[PDB]
Amino acid sequence: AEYQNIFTQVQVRGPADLGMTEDVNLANRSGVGPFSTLLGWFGNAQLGPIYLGSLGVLSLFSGLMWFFTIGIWFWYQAGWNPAVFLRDLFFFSLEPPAPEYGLSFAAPLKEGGLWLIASFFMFVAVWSWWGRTYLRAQALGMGKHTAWAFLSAIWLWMVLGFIRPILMGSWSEAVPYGIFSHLDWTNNFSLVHGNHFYNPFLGLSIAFLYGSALLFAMHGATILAVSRFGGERELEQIADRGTAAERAALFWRWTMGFNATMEGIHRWAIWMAVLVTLTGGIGILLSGTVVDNWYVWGQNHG
Amino acid sequence: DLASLAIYSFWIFLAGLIYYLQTENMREGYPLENEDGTPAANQGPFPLPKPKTFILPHGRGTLTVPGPESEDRPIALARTAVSEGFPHAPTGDPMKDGVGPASWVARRDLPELDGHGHNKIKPMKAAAGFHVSAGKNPIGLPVRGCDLEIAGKVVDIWVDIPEQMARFLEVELKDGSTRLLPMQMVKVQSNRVHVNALSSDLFAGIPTIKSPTEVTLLEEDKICGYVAGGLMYAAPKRKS
Amino acid sequence: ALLSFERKYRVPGGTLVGGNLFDFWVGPFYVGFFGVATFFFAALGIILIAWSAVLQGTWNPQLISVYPPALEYGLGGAPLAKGGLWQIITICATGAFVSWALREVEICRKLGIGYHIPFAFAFAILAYLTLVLFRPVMMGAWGYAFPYGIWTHLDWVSNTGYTYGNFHYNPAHMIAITFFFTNALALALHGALVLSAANPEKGKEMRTPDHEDTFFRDLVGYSIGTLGIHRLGLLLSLSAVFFSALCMIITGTIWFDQWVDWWQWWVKLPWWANIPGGING
Ligand code: BCL
Ligand SMILES: CC[C@H]1c2cc3[nH]c4c(c3C)C(=O)[C@H](C(=O)OC)c4c3nc(cc4[nH]c(cc(n2)[C@@H]1C)c(C(C)=O)c4C)[C@@H](C)[C@@H]3CCC(=O)OC/C=C(/C)CCC[C@@H](C)CCC[C@@H](C)CCCC(C)C
Ligand SMILES: CC[C@H]1c2cc3[nH]c4c(c3C)C(=O)[C@H](C(=O)OC)c4c3nc(cc4[nH]c(cc(n2)[C@@H]1C)c(C(C)=O)c4C)[C@@H](C)[C@@H]3CCC(=O)OC/C=C(\C)CCC[C@@H](C)CCC[C@@H](C)CCCC(C)C
Ligand SMILES: CC[C@H]1c2cc3[nH]c4c(c3C)C(=O)[C@H](C(=O)OC)c4c3nc(cc4[nH]c(cc(n2)[C@@H]1C)c(C(C)=O)c4C)[C@@H](C)[C@@H]3CCC(=O)OC/C=C(\C)CCC[C@@H](C)CCC[C@@H](C)CCCC(C)C
Ligand SMILES: COC(C)(C)C(=O)C/C=C(\C)CC/C=C(\C)CC/C=C(\C)CCCC/C(C)=C/CC[C@H](C)CC/C=C(\C)CCC=C(C)C
């Protein structure tokens, strides 16, 4: 049995890591949580510490208010009976206001003004959380890459329940919160628009999703192949190239006729991924605003 | 048509994106060489990028890439054929020479620093408050080689401090000297630690570290290169 | 044409088949036994597809398609323009993919690295073989497989999907998607992190893996670690493709009905089902 490095063979533990300081305000950073021997076998064993600020609490608040506002309504539908609640859990839905209410806030609670409430709560919670991904990096003096990549996911999310329903003139065009319900909205969207497969952006969105899975499978497997040369320490192979970096590049050169660099591969990474929700956000935004039917469009445009 | 515009606009963006991504990935190994080390004629459609310079932490200098490409070591290979595209046979002992699967890059002769400027890797005796938290503790386990002979015993675990993980097993030999075995190349069992990559006669060959409180980027590469190479090279003495 | 460091690694050996014979390079490409096999399976396979494009009377990759032998031919053979072609092409394909993975194993052996990559490749080959082989043979017709053509295979998807209703209701499919949707999130992060640290704010020193662990603990209160995230995205990836093959192998075989209806087992559990109120009450 040759050892493949998928699971840690022997864990070690040492003093809880409180982490680098730099310009971070340490008054807002919590204390260390427990150590999971379970987690240990795969990644780190150390939970925490977690930084929680004025913005970190705002986010963490709204995000729950968003999660409650829905489940309150999910209880309402259950008739406040836990057995039904559990049973019907995927069938519950909080739905956007009826089209007759257009873009107003006038729509009553049981008619979807309760939707708007939770939606607001979401909107606050997400951007405030995007606030974090920029700020935590600024504090450590690192790149904003996480902030920008996040922004890419936010894109599709803004298109879906915000930007598009505004351009379509009503909130009813938005996505309902519920497990089976939003699944239907997705499928329903396809039919309404003439088989979304004919949208050239879904064409690409799906390619990048597929490619994200292909590349991270390549990358991940690769680093694990060269981990015996300490491949996982990518940054110090960036500053000083190890045989790990060479053997990596060379597998792929010899296989596919070209290759990457240890900093380079991560640019392939960040992009291939980002472009999923990047493209796919456009594809949606264009649907119903500009192109009503993707089949139809597909006959007149290439 | 708006969408038709968007999508055209995208295919043009994506071409330039692939250009940028490819040029960026040319910051090492390029310009290409012929087998004799002279710059090759055909470099491909992609130009070298305008160079960048990294500021290494803790006064370690800088790195500018792309840059002058030299191996900074002697290569123990000679051509096996009269034309391009053929294997290059080692002249000497490829393990000792450091070629093929035993190849090593000549990287800095200083150890890797953690965020605070202390060495990333210390043996666990010198690691303060570091202890095995799970799995079988290998320390004191006899080490067997692919030829199923005892190569000596495990006298410590060299651990990565900031990632809190094992890296090497320091192994003591017959003559009482120790070598570092990469963790990824050892299978710690119930009754022993097993190394498939090397037979026992090859252990004494494992490149040695100078200050044995620490190990350096160059010394890791020499040891990791060495042990990995043994797979191909120790093949005659490997049973099973 | 080699890379500045390439030559030292170009020693002989590692071959599974044939010894020193095919062991050499063409440009950057390594050859090996299986380099040739791949070529041949790909060559043939392309030629058949090229010659299957004539029988249809087009060269238009948008138009060109090779359909499986119809349900009538079952699991047996079929005439060439009648779906025999697709059958051999699949043999050529399955050949050239497996010749590829094995060529990748021979490159692993020369570079003294782990087999992790062609191991992971095999998960994509298995998804494919599910679709063109394991599913059809369990269902008894090569016609159940997807046809080879750009849109025409996407037709196959939308038709195969809606046969079972909204396909979203396949639970194994929901699981597969959760992996695909996660993995892309894990790719976006992993890339954004490593890049942020190697490309910090103006004039600052290259950050350290310690800053990486810090940024995440600062963020979500945990960091999986660098050996972790690699195991992670590799798992999230193979996971994704595993449940993808799984979702499709149960479909049409052990479950042929409308997928949404499958979820009644939960609703119709005795300790709720007849309680008034709710959605299904
Ligand atoms: C209308 C249709 C239905 C539907 C019906 C189906 C059907 C039907 C199928 C899927 C499958 C999938 N669908 Mg679904 N799907 C729907 C809705 C969705 C939605 C969504 C947002 O709504 C998503 C995200 C998904 C996602 C998914 C994944 C779970 C899966 C695709 C990945 C995969 O299988 O990899 C598998 C990857 C491969 C097989 C890659 C093969 C690569 C091989 C090994 C080598 C290629 C070499 C190449 C030729 C070389 C090129 C030569 C040069 C070098 C370039 N579906 C709708 C409701 N879905 C598929 C699945 O699970 O299959 C197992 C599938 O069959
Ligand atoms: C191509 C873009 C990909 C992407 C990228 C991406 N996502 C990101 C980022 C990036 C780059 C971040 O930086 C950011 C992040 O912080 O990641 C960790 C994030 C993020 N992506 C997330 C989710 C997410 N990403 C998705 C997808 C994607 N994101 C794409 C694949 C999806 C999908 C597929 O739909 C989801 C659901 C979040 C984890 C995070 C954004 C955080 C956010 O906005 O939080 C809102 C605020 C809150 C306070 C959360 C409220 C919590 C409640 C809703 C649940 C409560 C559960 C509770 C009952 C449990 C109790 C505890 C138990 C232990 C008992
Ligand atoms: C069934 C209906 C048809 C369909 C529809 C469809 N697909 C879609 C959409 C729609 C309507 C999108 O909007 C989305 C898209 O990009 O469209 C172009 C998408 C898409 N279709 C895709 C794939 C796909 N679709 C397919 C099919 C189809 N899609 C059918 C034809 C198939 C196949 C095989 O048939 C595939 C593979 C993806 C490429 C893309 C979706 C990509 C993606 O990752 O999107 C999900 C991510 C987000 C919405 C980002 C959210 C980011 C944060 C804001 C999350 C915050 C969450 C937090 C507040 C709480 C979380 C809790 C805690 C963890 C904190
Ligand atoms: C399992 C995780 C993901 C994955 C992993 C993965 N893929 C891989 C690997 C790995 C680990 C490799 O090592 C290998 C590689 O070399 O990557 C660059 C590869 C690879 N994955 C590839 C493609 C690919 N992977 C996909 C998916 C995935 N691969 C999963 C998401 C997809 C999708 C989404 O559909 C595609 C298209 C190739 C780039 C490469 C394999 C190259 C190869 O084997 O080439 C040999 C064959 C030929 C050159 C030509 C074949 C011609 C004829 C023999 C047959 C004709 C085929 C016929 C079926 C045509 C179909 C037409 C379609 C329109 C239907
Ligand atoms: C016992 O349970 C209790 C009571 C504790 C609970 O609370 C349980 C709670 C539940 C189980 C609820 C769980 C909720 C769901 C299952 C969530 C399902 C939701 C989805 C699948 C989300 C899909 C789509 C989300 C989208 C796209 C949202 C779009 C948001 C918009 C971008 C925001 C727009 C904001 C609006 C419209 C307001 C405008 C005002 C401004 C100023 C911004």
Ligand SMILES: CCCCCCCCCCCC[N+](C)(C)[O-]
């Ligand atoms: C996504 C993973 C989430 C893990 C979050 C763990 C947070 C650690 C909080 C520990 C709190 C410790 N203390 C002393 C402040 O109570």
Ligand SMILES: CCCCCCCCCCCC[N+](C)(C)[O-]
């Ligand atoms: C809020 C908790 C304070 C930090 C203390 C952490 C202790 C780690 C948990 C004990 C480890 C036991 N075990 C079995 C996981 O090894």
Ligand SMILES: CCCCCCCCCCCC[N+](C)(C)[O-]
């Ligand atoms: C998101 C991280 C997932 C963590 C899952 C950890 C799985 C534990 C695996 C058990 C290890 C096998 N074992 C005990 C023999 O070592």
Ligand SMILES: CCCCCCCCCCCC[N+](C)(C)[O-]
């Ligand atoms: C408390 C929610 C925060 C404000 C965001 C949502 C606007 C309020 C909508 C409630 C509708 C009330 N009313 C009377 C119109 O039905």
Ligand SMILES: CCCCCCCCCCCC[N+](C)(C)[O-]
């Ligand atoms: C960053 C890597 C780039 C990979 C590019 C993937 C190309 C796939 C092209 C598919 C085109 C689909 N469609 C519908 C637009 O024609």
Ligand SMILES: CCCCCCCCCCCC[N+](C)(C)[O-]
């Ligand atoms: C969609 C992913 C494929 C992108 C192709 C990248 C460029 C291929 C040519 C690489 C150049 C190789 N070379 C000759 C410079 O060494």
Ligand SMILES: [Fe+3]
């Ligand atoms: Fe990486």
Ligand SMILES: [K+]
């Ligand atoms: K100690």
